[PDB]
Scaffold this active site. Sequence first.
Site, PDB file in Angstrom:
ATOM      1  N   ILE A 111       0.870  -1.191   0.000  1.00  0.00           N
ATOM      2  CA  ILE A 111       0.000   0.000   0.000  1.00  0.00           C
ATOM      3  C   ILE A 111       0.888   1.216   0.000  1.00  0.00           C
ATOM      4  CG2 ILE A 111      -1.709   1.373   1.308  1.00  0.00           C
ATOM      5  CD1 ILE A 111      -3.161  -1.079   1.993  1.00  0.00           C
ATOM      6  N   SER A 125       5.541  -1.303  -0.465  1.00  0.00           N
ATOM      7  CA  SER A 125       5.478  -0.661  -1.776  1.00  0.00           C
ATOM      8  C   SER A 125       6.806   0.019  -2.056  1.00  0.00           C
ATOM      9  CB  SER A 125       4.323   0.362  -1.818  1.00  0.00           C
ATOM     10  OG  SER A 125       4.367   1.090  -3.067  1.00  0.00           O
ATOM     11  N   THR A 168       4.827  -5.567  -9.754  1.00  0.00           N
ATOM     12  CA  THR A 168       3.410  -5.273 -10.012  1.00  0.00           C
ATOM     13  C   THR A 168       3.226  -4.939 -11.488  1.00  0.00           C
ATOM     14  OG1 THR A 168       2.971  -4.535  -7.745  1.00  0.00           O
ATOM     15  CG2 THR A 168       1.458  -3.808  -9.434  1.00  0.00           C
ATOM     16  N   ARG A 212     -10.138   7.232 -12.088  1.00  0.00           N
ATOM     17  CA  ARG A 212     -10.554   7.117 -10.691  1.00  0.00           C
ATOM     18  C   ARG A 212     -11.397   8.338 -10.332  1.00  0.00           C
ATOM     19  NH1 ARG A 212      -5.279   4.911  -7.300  1.00  0.00           N
ATOM     20  NH2 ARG A 212      -4.845   3.089  -8.628  1.00  0.00           N
ATOM     21  N   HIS A 216      -5.563  -5.704  -8.225  1.00  0.00           N
ATOM     22  CA  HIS A 216      -5.277  -4.404  -7.629  1.00  0.00           C
ATOM     23  C   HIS A 216      -6.521  -3.835  -6.934  1.00  0.00           C
ATOM     24  CE1 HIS A 216      -1.727  -1.622  -7.951  1.00  0.00           C
ATOM     25  NE2 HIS A 216      -2.577  -0.865  -7.294  1.00  0.00           N
ATOM     26  N   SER A 228      -7.362  -9.234  -3.375  1.00  0.00           N
ATOM     27  CA  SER A 228      -8.385  -8.396  -4.022  1.00  0.00           C
ATOM     28  C   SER A 228      -9.767  -8.846  -3.576  1.00  0.00           C
ATOM     29  CB  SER A 228      -8.278  -8.379  -5.550  1.00  0.00           C
ATOM     30  OG  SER A 228      -7.084  -7.681  -5.957  1.00  0.00           O
ATOM     31  N   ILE A 239     -10.544  -9.554  -0.025  1.00  0.00           N
ATOM     32  CA  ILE A 239     -10.573 -10.135   1.304  1.00  0.00           C
ATOM     33  C   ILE A 239     -11.020  -9.080   2.323  1.00  0.00           C
ATOM     34  CG2 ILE A 239      -9.241 -11.239   3.057  1.00  0.00           C
ATOM     35  CD1 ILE A 239      -9.290 -13.018   0.738  1.00  0.00           C
ATOM     36  N   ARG A 240     -12.058  -9.402   3.110  1.00  0.00           N
ATOM     37  CA  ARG A 240     -12.550  -8.500   4.169  1.00  0.00           C
ATOM     38  C   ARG A 240     -12.637  -9.192   5.521  1.00  0.00           C
ATOM     39  NH1 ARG A 240     -11.185  -5.964   0.661  1.00  0.00           N
ATOM     40  NH2 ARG A 240     -12.194  -4.275  -0.503  1.00  0.00           N
TER      41      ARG A 240
HETATM   42  C1  LIG Z   1      -4.615   2.850  -0.835  1.00  0.00           C
HETATM   43  C2  LIG Z   1      -4.016   1.671  -1.622  1.00  0.00           C
HETATM   44  C3  LIG Z   1      -2.811   1.869  -2.296  1.00  0.00           C
HETATM   45  C4  LIG Z   1      -2.225   0.800  -2.999  1.00  0.00           C
HETATM   46  N1  LIG Z   1      -0.886   0.882  -3.230  1.00  0.00           N
HETATM   47  C5  LIG Z   1      -0.296  -0.187  -3.928  1.00  0.00           C
HETATM   48  C6  LIG Z   1       1.150  -0.204  -4.237  1.00  0.00           C
HETATM   49  O1  LIG Z   1       1.901   0.728  -3.915  1.00  0.00           O
HETATM   50  N2  LIG Z   1       1.665  -1.285  -4.887  1.00  0.00           N
HETATM   51  C7  LIG Z   1       0.920  -2.320  -5.273  1.00  0.00           C
HETATM   52  O2  LIG Z   1       1.474  -3.333  -5.894  1.00  0.00           O
HETATM   53  N3  LIG Z   1      -0.405  -2.412  -5.009  1.00  0.00           N
HETATM   54  C8  LIG Z   1      -1.057  -1.374  -4.352  1.00  0.00           C
HETATM   55  N4  LIG Z   1      -2.404  -1.500  -3.976  1.00  0.00           N
HETATM   56  C9  LIG Z   1      -3.149  -2.723  -4.270  1.00  0.00           C
HETATM   57  C10 LIG Z   1      -2.995  -3.629  -3.082  1.00  0.00           C
HETATM   58  O3  LIG Z   1      -1.682  -4.235  -2.962  1.00  0.00           O
HETATM   59  C11 LIG Z   1      -3.980  -4.812  -3.165  1.00  0.00           C
HETATM   60  O4  LIG Z   1      -3.800  -5.484  -4.428  1.00  0.00           O
HETATM   61  C12 LIG Z   1      -5.456  -4.351  -3.016  1.00  0.00           C
HETATM   62  O5  LIG Z   1      -5.556  -3.435  -1.891  1.00  0.00           O
HETATM   63  C13 LIG Z   1      -6.348  -5.528  -2.757  1.00  0.00           C
HETATM   64  O6  LIG Z   1      -7.703  -5.169  -2.956  1.00  0.00           O
HETATM   65  P1  LIG Z   1      -8.664  -4.870  -1.639  1.00  0.00           P
HETATM   66  O7  LIG Z   1      -7.899  -3.888  -0.812  1.00  0.00           O
HETATM   67  O8  LIG Z   1      -9.875  -4.344  -2.335  1.00  0.00           O
HETATM   68  O9  LIG Z   1      -8.912  -6.170  -0.985  1.00  0.00           O
HETATM   69  C14 LIG Z   1      -2.945  -0.470  -3.088  1.00  0.00           C
HETATM   70  C15 LIG Z   1      -4.174  -0.663  -2.442  1.00  0.00           C
HETATM   71  C16 LIG Z   1      -4.728   0.402  -1.691  1.00  0.00           C
HETATM   72  C17 LIG Z   1      -6.048   0.261  -0.940  1.00  0.00           C
END
Ligand SMILES: Cc1cc2nc3c(=O)[nH]c(=O)nc-3n(C[C@H](O)[C@H](O)[C@H](O)COP(=O)(O)O)c2cc1C
Lengths: 394, 394, 394, 394
Positions: free
Chosen positions: C99, C129, C179, C188, C291, C322, C324-325
């Site tokens: 994140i 990240s 990624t 968005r 993602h 993607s 999971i809650r």
């Molecule tokens: C605020 C936010 C920022 C994200 N930043 C990145 C990142 O820097 N690198 C990355 O590979 N994925 C990023 N993602 C995707 C997450 O690694 C992950 O795939 C995603 O949060 C999963 O979906 P979910 O949160 O809806 O369950 C981010 C997710 C969120 C919520």
Amino acid sequence: MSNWGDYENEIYGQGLVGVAPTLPMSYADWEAHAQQALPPGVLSYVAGGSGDEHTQRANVEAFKHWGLMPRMLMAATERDLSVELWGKTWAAPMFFAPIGVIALCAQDGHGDAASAQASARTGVPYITSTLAVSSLEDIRKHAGDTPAYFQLYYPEDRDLAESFIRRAEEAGYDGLVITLDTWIFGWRPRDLTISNFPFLRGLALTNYVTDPVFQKKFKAHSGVEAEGLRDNPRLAADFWHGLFGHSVTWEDIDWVRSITKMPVILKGIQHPDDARRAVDSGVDGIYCSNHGGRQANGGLPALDCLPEVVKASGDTPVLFDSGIRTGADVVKALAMGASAVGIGRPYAWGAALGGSKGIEHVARSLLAEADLIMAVDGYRNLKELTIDALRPTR
Amino acid sequence: MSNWGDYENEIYGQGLVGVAPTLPMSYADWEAHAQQALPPGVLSYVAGGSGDEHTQRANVEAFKHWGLMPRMLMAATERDLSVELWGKTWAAPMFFAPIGVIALCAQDGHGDAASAQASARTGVPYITSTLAVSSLEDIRKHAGDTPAYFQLYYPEDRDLAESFIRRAEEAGYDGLVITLDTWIFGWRPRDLTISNFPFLRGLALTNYVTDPVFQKKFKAHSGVEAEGLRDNPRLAADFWHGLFGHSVTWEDIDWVRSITKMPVILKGIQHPDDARRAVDSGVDGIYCSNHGGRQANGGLPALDCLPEVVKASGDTPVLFDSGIRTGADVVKALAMGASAVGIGRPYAWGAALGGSKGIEHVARSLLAEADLIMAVDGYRNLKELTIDALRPTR
Amino acid sequence: MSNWGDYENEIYGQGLVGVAPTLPMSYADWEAHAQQALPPGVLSYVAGGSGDEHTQRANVEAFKHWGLMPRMLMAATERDLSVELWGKTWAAPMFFAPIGVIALCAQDGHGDAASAQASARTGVPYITSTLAVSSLEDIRKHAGDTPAYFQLYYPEDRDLAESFIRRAEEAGYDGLVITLDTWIFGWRPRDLTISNFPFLRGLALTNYVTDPVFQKKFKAHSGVEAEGLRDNPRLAADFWHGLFGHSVTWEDIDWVRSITKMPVILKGIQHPDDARRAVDSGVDGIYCSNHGGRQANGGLPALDCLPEVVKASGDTPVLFDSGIRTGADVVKALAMGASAVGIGRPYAWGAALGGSKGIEHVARSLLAEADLIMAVDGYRNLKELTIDALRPTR
Amino acid sequence: MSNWGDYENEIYGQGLVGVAPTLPMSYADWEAHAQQALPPGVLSYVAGGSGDEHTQRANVEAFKHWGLMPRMLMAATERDLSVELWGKTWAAPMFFAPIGVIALCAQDGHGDAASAQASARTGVPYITSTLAVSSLEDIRKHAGDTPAYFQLYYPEDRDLAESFIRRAEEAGYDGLVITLDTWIFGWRPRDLTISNFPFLRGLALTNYVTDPVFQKKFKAHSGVEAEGLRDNPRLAADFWHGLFGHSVTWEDIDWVRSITKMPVILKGIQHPDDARRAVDSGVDGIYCSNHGGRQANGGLPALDCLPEVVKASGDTPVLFDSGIRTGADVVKALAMGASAVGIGRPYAWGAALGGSKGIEHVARSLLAEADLIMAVDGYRNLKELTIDALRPTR
Ligand SMILES: Cc1cc2nc3c(=O)[nH]c(=O)nc-3n(C[C@H](O)[C@H](O)[C@H](O)COP(=O)(O)O)c2cc1C
Ligand SMILES: Cc1cc2nc3c(=O)[nH]c(=O)nc-3n(C[C@H](O)[C@H](O)[C@H](O)COP(=O)(O)O)c2cc1C
Ligand SMILES: Cc1cc2nc3c(=O)[nH]c(=O)nc-3n(C[C@H](O)[C@H](O)[C@H](O)COP(=O)(O)O)c2cc1C
Ligand SMILES: Cc1cc2nc3c(=O)[nH]c(=O)nc-3n(C[C@H](O)[C@H](O)[C@H](O)COP(=O)(O)O)c2cc1C
């Protein structure tokens, strides 16, 4: 410095380079967001008042029934909001009122140190409660060069009361506030409903736990040593409860004045003859307050009492709290003759959304708005903000 | 003409042939629809007021506490709503109050030209702000044969103030309104929350950009030529901000009167002794206003001030704004002794839903309702609408 | 820690002595409260997804349509939820997904360090990240003895890519996650509406500002040296934007594997043929993800892809995120063949309400529920949890 | 314009200098705001559909049940979204579907000219309705260099039909769209409830009032000449109603093809056998549509018909509309084999909030999202986007 209203210029300046504010700008938004950001027990304790909360709400509603008369062509381009109180010059006519659970309003558990640091940075004095997570000595160091005040909850043990007062004097506090309207706890349905009472779980008892008198008396009662007490303060919570609330007498006030050089300020005064008797006996300060309606739901807004307390107090300074939510309210209470006004609920919300910087934003927002109202409406300093500048409104 | 109330007959007439209205008919519906039709920054700027907005709301609420006494058997079958002000006969006792962002309230970005054209068609005078997208010369041409007034924001440069006043006189404006309650900006939480401040993005600066004095002084400060300034006014937005707000003095007012033949009208007066001093010094007009509660949240409704300002002003005309939402409010302020009443918020909503024709519909709707109330309730002209025709109500 | 489900016993144990929980216990309450506790720009960035957010929602809804078959009389009184991945034994089949703004989800501005500390205390691996406030070297130290993984945003500059990769190896990371689905940012609406994009303000760029290659290349580009860059990272935000997003190729993956001993894991795989080609290439892990629906609103739930990606990946481990809650979702993804499950949105809310302890509570709550479901429904370990334990449900 | 997705970079770029967007960014917000910004009769006409509106809703819901499969490591860093249709290269696979009251969706009453200008600036073709406020000759000029199409409402008078067809050819239109599903108006409760039907008030009849055949035939019928008709088109509204709706036959289509060189495109086809018979007849384009569910509430989503209509149409181009709201929907319809996708309701909202610039923002937003989805999910051009890229979803 130049003026407190300058705070809005940095907010607008940052927007021009794409930097948005991160904290709210009005009490309504502070309250709505902060209430959701808090644990449920802390929310209940902080938002809740006594009975059906009519007094807590009427305190706030009172401010809607006074209007400041705008004066044009006064060119109040430089405001002087300083006030001199018991020999110290305050940079602003506003202070953080004592809040015994402020430490828990911050996520890190140190909202009281956070408030003192906000006071160091702003010049807005902090009044520490007797209830706290940081000791009164540590709080006073965190307050830096800003005048700081110690609020006593007078215990049912004179050796302990003297120890607290002595400690505050030695630590460099500028005055002693004695709270008169909470020596027993009022009926508080929100806390009762979930049987929520943090201090009986041993929270915020650091000024007792660190006190030599309390340590010795608790050790005689329980066999527990000072180190064990420090490691589990809840061991002493029942003992604390047994001595927490002495019902203060006029004779007690005379005794307190004779053992400290600090100015003594009485908090909770509403009746003008109580102010009169106190001033005639040598009390240094009158603090008009009904504890935000949290301890008794008798129905009388605190602001309704302020003008007659001011009349009765003569040239003794009068502090005011209970119901202040915006800078407009600050200006109105100052026009009624308070020398300075205390902030309660708003800075607890500040602590919940941003710790020390949130508290600071609340204080700077309140002062910015007060200073800008004085500028626009033609009042260049607090001496010119007199009670005839107000009008009653529907 | 015959009478302003005739406007409803065309609305009902069109329904008989199946042609429905396309714009709303009440302030509540104007506001609800227009707020959704605006960009978010414009909505925040226009709807928002100072602090918690209690003053902005109390201005409106004040009108609910006066009632007109109906008089029967008066046969007021022809009303005379004309008023003579500084030598000009106005067809109606109502004007568009100055709005610095009205240009942006219209989708085409020219809501100020739209307002002036609506004034040309209706006879309702337009007061242009100093802030505008069309220059004051163009606005005055768009206003046609209707009396037009120039609202000065007195800058912190006397050469520029004189240039504006001279330009307004040469362009044929009928009077100069000097706004006294916004030389610094009040605490406005809705705008602060999103750091919204359109003029610092170089919007609505056309009267500066086209001014010879401002062009020369900005060029000395920055090296930027007049053409570059016209192509990107934001280059000068910081320079504008530095000179926007002079805090006007009584001596300034004397100087302004000595350099123009236009009548001078002071906007923002609330205190009767300020009205008294102004009238005794030769000011031509008093404009009782608190800027819709947008610049200071001191709590005093503007209408609460109007009767004593009228008393103090004697035979000097008094204009009134802040809180007018329907034709009933127009009639009440006129009965209290205002010579004419200014419309703010309602015509910004008009601009948002229909440009020039929307503004016109707002003005004609307000006047229709005022004229019909006078007809039904037995008041045939404004001379007969006296302050004893009102009663206070709960 | 005999079993993850033991976490509930501490929560109940504490209520018996009058100590109530302070953090929420369900995702719905985490989300509701945390969303109010955040600044508005962080809320928009974190909660928002791509387009009308159907994909982000459908990811979550997919878990409602699989049901685990309960097995009775299995006496799963001891559970083994460990997993061995690339030579390291994870104590839990769960990790914190990368994140890039997690730092800003905590009030202290160091939610990334806070996550690594929660990983150090729980044994739930953290994936940092490339975007972060703490350097990747500092994060790895904060993660203690827990396996840690570095998520690479492959830049349009191979020297810089090689620096990042080398630094992560030297810093002790246990794997490299590339990624594949964000070399360009998707549409968005929530961010577009307020034009919110934190990195362009120079936030979370520490891994670039502390990188020797980035320093030299930016110094060549702009003239500013490393200290001016560390002191104002926004100076380099435009330069960062120019190189942030290289669209990775199969040849790049070959090149990456040749310069590191770390296992290489590809994140964003949804199509089985992509997983098969990667495994045939000697890629070490497949990270099935879309993602969170945050980058493209194409409408295919990630979970719908997982079984076929598992099948195509042979004995190569598949990670999954993607949607999971709750811990029930964790069990269902493991049953479909994920070796471990990634957590995103839920631990951002944890950071917002409680910093590191809040993140830890989210992680221990998810694992406790997953463990208890396995206990009650008769699955002793991850081997016994297979896709035939599941049924499709309406 | 290297790629449509670049539009988001201007939006973010502007926020970095404090310029916020002024129009919404998602369909849900376009609809919410635009609906309030419209007159009530236009809202009823535009938002309303046939019957209980299930078909209009089901058209939109169908897009939620198809998901695009993301393909990684495709490096689609340059996208080709162009399409060649009847010898002209469209820059986008998207067009503005005909809207006979679009003129009245804009505040200035010229939303049809505004659409043609947005087409001129974007390269998104406009299809004008036969119903319009600007003549078809004026619309074609306003569309600049962008291909433009004329939508014929075939009248009960072959001389008039031939005039319309000839005028469109002479005016430079690139194709003739014959709408087959509105020769009689379907049951529309929202319009029936307020008896709203704009054309019967003589609105949007300019192509008839400027037509020489219509002029002569109406002059024969009523006695009024061309100037009295141009001055009051409602004089001819009953006559228009009598001839507006000819139920077209296969023989009419043969006759139409014989009198024009323009490609002939049939709009409203849902059944594969109808598409097959049309292509066998030498019809040039098939326009799969159910009129947005506005004319008949039979309940079959248009999207459900598209794959089989594509299959039956061979190498003849198929256009598609009815239910497109976002760029994700555009990608899904193209993947099913539409050569280009039509936009209806969304650009009416654009007109309501911003005239031509609002229409343009809707178009560029849809295309940006579609382009970015293709980039992130690995589809470089429209050839690579085929029905096997899609999966059915719950
Ligand atoms: C605020 C936010 C920022 C994200 N930043 C990145 C990142 O820097 N690198 C990355 O590979 N994925 C990023 N993602 C995707 C997450 O690694 C992950 O795939 C995603 O949060 C999963 O979906 P979910 O949160 O809806 O369950 C981010 C997710 C969120 C919520
Ligand atoms: C959560 C909370 C705890 C408080 N604890 C103390 C205290 O320890 N000592 C004290 O004198 N007053 C205490 N007060 C009262 C405040 O000093 C002050 O009088 C009150 O907050 C003013 O009312 P308002 O917050 O409604 O404006 C507390 C107030 C709140 C909100
Ligand atoms: C959006 C807006 C901008 C304004 N700008 C100006 C101005 O440029 N000059 C000025 O003298 N007053 C300005 N005002 C104040 C109006 O002249 C007037 O006093 C006020 O709108 C009356 O309050 P009401 O709208 O609540 O009735 C503005 C008012 C609004 C609503
Ligand atoms: C207000 C309105 C009026 C319409 N006018 C026409 C028209 O004149 N000619 C025509 O062929 N179709 C007309 N249609 C149908 C549209 O061309 C298109 O098929 C429909 O809007 C697509 O459905 P959607 O808007 O629900 O996506 C109209 C649509 C709307 C919303």
